[PDB]
Ligand binder design. Structure first.
Ligand SMILES: O=c1[nH]c(=O)c2nn[nH]c2[nH]1
Ligand SMILES: O=c1[nH]c(=O)c2nn[nH]c2[nH]1
Ligand SMILES: O=c1[nH]c(=O)c2nn[nH]c2[nH]1
Ligand SMILES: O=c1[nH]c(=O)c2nn[nH]c2[nH]1
Ligand code: NA
Ligand code: NA
Ligand code: NA
Ligand code: NA
Ligand SMILES: [Xe]
Ligand SMILES: [Xe]
Ligand SMILES: [Xe]
Ligand SMILES: [Xe]
Ligand SMILES: [Xe]
Ligand SMILES: [Xe]
Ligand SMILES: [Xe]
Ligand SMILES: [Xe]
Lengths: 295, 295, 295, 295
């Protein structure tokens, strides 16, 4: 037998950082969960019980805190790139670092119509994420994403004209509820190293904001022919607005809301045009994915 | 042996309702999870296998949908009271109904600074809840709550002057992070029946909004001496603003963020006045409760 | 305003203890999650910012570890009673301690038909729990429970003869699936203090084992007329076997498995006597409760 | 823009099947959660709103139940292969099916030392899983796994001789707790189609049992030099016992249990050789992965 692939490190490292402006008194907080996995010339730790090649996962944890102390933690694309580069430069035998960051929302509170200097609210479990792969001699690959963005529209969704055969019971519809949890990922062109990542810093927050805005607007405004057709429109627009993105991937559950026939009870009308009360279905759910790239 | 207490019913009934304004085209959605448990002269179903006394839990589920079709579902205090009253009036042998409702957020989307007519976002897992107990000949008892409101302040929290003995290692502090998930419940004076609940309908949404506003403002503005002292201030204000409330209860975790001493690494300073990077602790957590009533 | 009730302490304190037999080499592990909440003359911490009355929750955490070091942690009824008694005896102004313990399963592994001396498996998320309330001058009240015991029987469950009215669609049945997650609690007669709890130590593990055995056997063997009738049989037997128990409470979800009509597809028969494939329903669920005491 | 990749289908389809032996009266239950995603000539549904190419996800759900009715559901490798093959053969334009199955435990109850004919218990949240990829003209690729197997050993784990630099605080140890949740996957050689899968049916359950047995025995018996070294031993043995497996992958968290220094309290000794009470850490955790193949 032989080791075909190996990676190891520390998962679920929770980190909080505060920035304090002495001038204005304003404080800003960042909270993330970080995972770092390393690869390199480490097979002997598996095959020969040779621990001399192991950077302890406890040390990886320490390094995350030290790096957060000495560097900006925003945008997460930059922080992940700094963190990953550290490992491949510091350790001769480590040749790849894989950094995943989940950013948690701490939104400044408005109190009496004024932004509060040091108080924050978690407005939704929506996350902003990054995956950064730093590979010695091959640069830095960054995938940015948003996830956990949950939306619903109560009309202006249709689904008709699908394949009908002996397995089909679904009725065509011209008016239904559409609800989903959005997972959207944009993949950046490969960067040569940290200097190039630094040169593009302003694009990271801007592109996240664009991706979010395009998602919300298209969802709200499209008279949707299917999840497939609407998601494609989203992806097309993001690629049009940021030339440094190579691909956009969406993964979308179709969270079903079923009509409830109440006609058995006193002829009560609650279907089609008369539908008012629905039963949200926890499972099963449709799952629709697509990756859109350039011609 | 004897049956000392019994209740039974249907839990986790998900319900969605849409309201459509024909004039304006504007649609509004409500989504809830409902539980209804009944009590009454039902002991023989347990002791003698006498099912004749059982209103099937499946029928309770049907009744929830039918009631939602025929009545407003907002405010939840009113809907719960209608639903509970139904069971005690319809069935001679049922003498109490216990209705719990969790309301899920569907907030109208703003697209290009305009409220969208039929598109919604789940902004946070914060819930608005009601517990309604309808007891034949004893009226309607309603407890209203908000839960899952997660907040953090990065300064203006202190904790010093506590008891110190041979079990104590905690250092006094004049500047710490304070973060919690707020669970706040206000208990209404007993109502004689549905007519009285109806007469107070406007107070329900208003008092929820007040409770939320008081919680957020007090948290942000109090230079907190402890969770105990700040929570008491919240409760006092709510009781002052709504005379029909008898008690206010808060239950608050103290979600700890620990300093990280980095001085072992190149004398790096990250404690006290120099603290920038902290480690959020998933567990254990403080838990502080209090019920405040009138003198 | 006035403080009507208050309690505070530390939740989610994870504790592991190992016992090592020097003679045999055999090791035994215990893992629990502990919550301790205190009550007493502490209102001034809420109303006057007087922290002098507060035993810090951090100190409560320390006390849990110290108590675990110096005392047996099994049975949990005894450990909870020791822990609770400590607080009311040590602090003059603390008059009640409320201790909740969840015990996690670590079952010794059998390797080649032999019990292994120091290796363990988590066989199911079933828990054994205790709630101990120690109240100065009123003794020790203990509620013991098992929870998270998930079972299913594929036949020998019936449900017919229930109330049928204009809200009813449920068909009577003489053969259905019955599945539940068992939550069962037995409440001990009040104990005068720690000496009395100590005198009954052997009864605690024995009664837990009896409660578990009675639950499983009755579930498997009863040709069940309803969840109500079967649960009552369980409770009756437990009360018959342990005279020091005052009440037994069961809380049981009815986790539904629905038939799937496939006759639309090539006349395929999958209902009634021909039912083979079913759809487990995540929600809603029936919820049936009962408390059984002595005549 | 262009569609670079697309797949869609139904997730979280819960399925239960019962087998009834008329001769013996013995009943056996199977419960699974199934996901099916399709690929093929479907880009026009995304780009042109052409639904004619879409097999509705609702129809995929129906097909899962119909297939379960007409075929054995065990071993899951066979059921997944039947299900996947169905889609690529039935629909000309569908060229790949991806089937994921999670099997839930329903273990027959022993009552008074006898196996009960129709009563079952969920003994642990451990799962047996399959991923089956059926690709037109390229055969059937099957990955089998077990997951959620949670174990702990209280001694006979060491970790010393790792890299020490200015980022390292971890002390070397010759005696520690080791606990993990095992995720192990074995990848079968590619099969030409359903006939070949059928020919190997007995190997599927046998290899699952071997993988489980090897995992448990090696964990219990290895005087572990690291998670890396012990996991490699597991993988090596599985590859030695089943020639039709090409690779074995393990992914293992290192769930830390920390010593608690209690010496501040009355010189209490609870570290090193005197360690009895430990603090389980919820996060962070080490994460160690490896894929082992043949020389
Ligand atoms: O078994 C271990 N492997 C590792 O890589 C490691 N790093 N810290 N502790 C550890 N334990
Ligand atoms: O056992 C049952 N008890 C009930 O009360 C009930 N209601 N519907 N199905 C039921 N099954
Ligand atoms: O606000 C607090 N209240 C308390 O009771 C406490 N105990 N430790 N830290 C604390 N913080
Ligand atoms: O938008 C949809 N896309 C689909 O593929 C589908 N299948 N059923 N319902 C559906 N809705
Ligand atoms: Na390197
Ligand atoms: Na009545
Ligand atoms: Na006392
Ligand atoms: Na095909
Ligand atoms: Xe951070
Ligand atoms: Xe969508
Ligand atoms: Xe609703
Ligand atoms: Xe607070
Ligand atoms: Xe313990
Ligand atoms: Xe039951
Ligand atoms: Xe199944
Ligand atoms: Xe391991």
């Amino acid at each position: 037998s032989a080791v075909k692939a190996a990676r190891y490190g520390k998962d679920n490292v929770r980190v909080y950082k505060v920035h304090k402006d002495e001038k204005t008194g304003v404080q800003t907080v960042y909270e993330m969960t970080v995972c770092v996995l390393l690869e390199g010339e480490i097979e002997t730790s598996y095959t020969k019980a040779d621990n001399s090649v192991i950077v302890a996962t406890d040390s990886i944890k320490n390094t995350i805190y030290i790096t957060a102390k000495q560097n900006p933690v925003t945008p997460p694309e930059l922080f992940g790139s700094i963190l990953g580069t550290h490992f491949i430069e510091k350790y001769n035998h480590i040749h790849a670092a894989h950094v995943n960051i989940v950013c948690h929302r701490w939104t400044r509170m408005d109190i009496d119509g004024k932004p509060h200097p040091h108080s924050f609210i978690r407005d939704s479990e929506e996350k902003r994420n990054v995956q950064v792969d730093v590979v010695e001699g091959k640069g830095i690959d960054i995938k940015s994403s948003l996830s956990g963005l949950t939306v619903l529209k109560s009309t202006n969704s249709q689904f008709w004209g699908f394949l009908r055969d002996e397995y089909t019971t679904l009725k065509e519809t011209w008016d239904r509820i559409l609800s989903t949890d959005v997972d959207a990922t944009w993949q950046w062109k490969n960067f040569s190293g940290l200097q190039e990542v630094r040169s593009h810093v302003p694009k990271f927050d801007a592109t996240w904001a664009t991706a979010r805005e395009v998602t919300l607007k298209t969802f709200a405004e499209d008279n949707s022919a299917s999840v497939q057709a609407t998601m494609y429109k989203m992806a097309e627009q993001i690629l049009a607005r940021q030339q440094l993105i190579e691909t956009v991937e969406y993964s979308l559950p179709n969270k079903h809301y079923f009509e409830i026939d109440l006609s058995w009870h006193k002829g009560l009308q609650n279907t089609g045009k008369n539908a008012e009360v629905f039963a949200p279905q926890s499972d099963p759910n449709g799952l629709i994915k697509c990756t859109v790239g350039r011609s």
